[PDB]
Design an enzyme around this catalytic site. Structure first.
Site, PDB file in Angstrom:
ATOM      1  N   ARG A 192     -50.941  35.076  86.002  1.00  0.00           N
ATOM      2  CA  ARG A 192     -49.946  35.317  86.998  1.00  0.00           C
ATOM      3  C   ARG A 192     -49.649  36.813  87.034  1.00  0.00           C
ATOM      4  O   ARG A 192     -49.564  37.464  85.978  1.00  0.00           O
ATOM      5  CB  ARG A 192     -48.717  34.540  86.655  1.00  0.00           C
ATOM      6  CG  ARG A 192     -47.466  34.950  87.372  1.00  0.00           C
ATOM      7  CD  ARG A 192     -46.379  34.160  86.828  1.00  0.00           C
ATOM      8  NE  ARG A 192     -45.141  34.319  87.529  1.00  0.00           N
ATOM      9  CZ  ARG A 192     -44.070  33.564  87.275  1.00  0.00           C
ATOM     10  NH1 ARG A 192     -44.145  32.544  86.418  1.00  0.00           N
ATOM     11  NH2 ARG A 192     -42.966  33.733  87.970  1.00  0.00           N
ATOM     12  N   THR A 208     -46.259  37.047  95.390  1.00  0.00           N
ATOM     13  CA  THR A 208     -47.019  36.895  96.584  1.00  0.00           C
ATOM     14  C   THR A 208     -46.517  35.619  97.271  1.00  0.00           C
ATOM     15  O   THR A 208     -46.007  34.751  96.620  1.00  0.00           O
ATOM     16  CB  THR A 208     -48.470  36.673  96.274  1.00  0.00           C
ATOM     17  OG1 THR A 208     -48.552  35.596  95.374  1.00  0.00           O
ATOM     18  CG2 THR A 208     -49.124  37.844  95.734  1.00  0.00           C
ATOM     19  N   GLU A 246     -47.033  31.971  98.815  1.00  0.00           N
ATOM     20  CA  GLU A 246     -48.005  30.931  98.553  1.00  0.00           C
ATOM     21  C   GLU A 246     -48.858  30.606  99.765  1.00  0.00           C
ATOM     22  O   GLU A 246     -48.595  31.118 100.840  1.00  0.00           O
ATOM     23  CB  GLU A 246     -47.302  29.687  97.949  1.00  0.00           C
ATOM     24  CG  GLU A 246     -48.303  28.627  97.418  1.00  0.00           C
ATOM     25  CD  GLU A 246     -49.309  29.036  96.258  1.00  0.00           C
ATOM     26  OE1 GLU A 246     -49.005  28.694  95.074  1.00  0.00           O
ATOM     27  OE2 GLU A 246     -50.475  29.330  96.456  1.00  0.00           O
ATOM     28  N   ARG A 258     -49.529  30.020  82.165  1.00  0.00           N
ATOM     29  CA  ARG A 258     -50.237  31.124  82.844  1.00  0.00           C
ATOM     30  C   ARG A 258     -49.970  32.444  82.155  1.00  0.00           C
ATOM     31  O   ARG A 258     -48.861  32.729  81.905  1.00  0.00           O
ATOM     32  CB  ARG A 258     -49.759  31.260  84.265  1.00  0.00           C
ATOM     33  CG  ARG A 258     -50.088  29.989  85.110  1.00  0.00           C
ATOM     34  CD  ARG A 258     -49.727  30.167  86.578  1.00  0.00           C
ATOM     35  NE  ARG A 258     -48.291  30.175  86.731  1.00  0.00           N
ATOM     36  CZ  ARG A 258     -47.602  30.217  87.862  1.00  0.00           C
ATOM     37  NH1 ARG A 258     -48.190  30.249  89.060  1.00  0.00           N
ATOM     38  NH2 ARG A 258     -46.287  30.310  87.798  1.00  0.00           N
TER      39      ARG A 258
END
Length: 119
Positions: free
Chosen positions: A19, A25, A27, A65
């Site tokens: 990540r 950002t 989706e 992540r």
């Protein structure tokens, strides 16, 4: 802080999800989602060399992540998305925040230039 190699990610021999620390950002299903994905993919592929840089806090989120600053031939993905108006600077109370001001600056440049998200 230090940069480590990764390849197209493959980190220390394993694939992990990464990540983009300090940036949000949109989706895939949101406005600028597809353009954010496509900016980022191209920047990664065209890069001769990919590097991951962890911050001084947690290295993983609750989803497993990698929380990192990702660099294509020495250019920070995170920052370039943000400069393109293709990501917003994310909130962080404390900890994993070392490139915050760098990234704020990019956002400012992007906002005043009215790019993508700011428009």
């Amino acid at each position: 802080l230090h940069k480590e190699p990764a390849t197209l990610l493959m980190y220390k021999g394993q694939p992990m999800t990464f990540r983009l620390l300090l940036v949000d950002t949109p989706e895939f299903n949101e406005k600028y989602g597809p353009e954010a994905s496509a900016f980022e993919k191209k920047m990664k592929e065209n890069a001769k060399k990919i590097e991951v840089e962890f911050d001084k806090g947690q290295r993983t989120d609750k989803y497993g992540r990698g929380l990192a600053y990702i660099y294509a031939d020495g250019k920070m993905v995170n920052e370039a998305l943000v400069r393109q108006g293709l990501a917003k600077v994310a909130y962080v109370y404390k900890g994993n925040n070392t490139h915050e001001q760098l990234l704020r600056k990019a956002e400012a440049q992007a906002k005043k230039e009215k790019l993508n998200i700011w428009s």
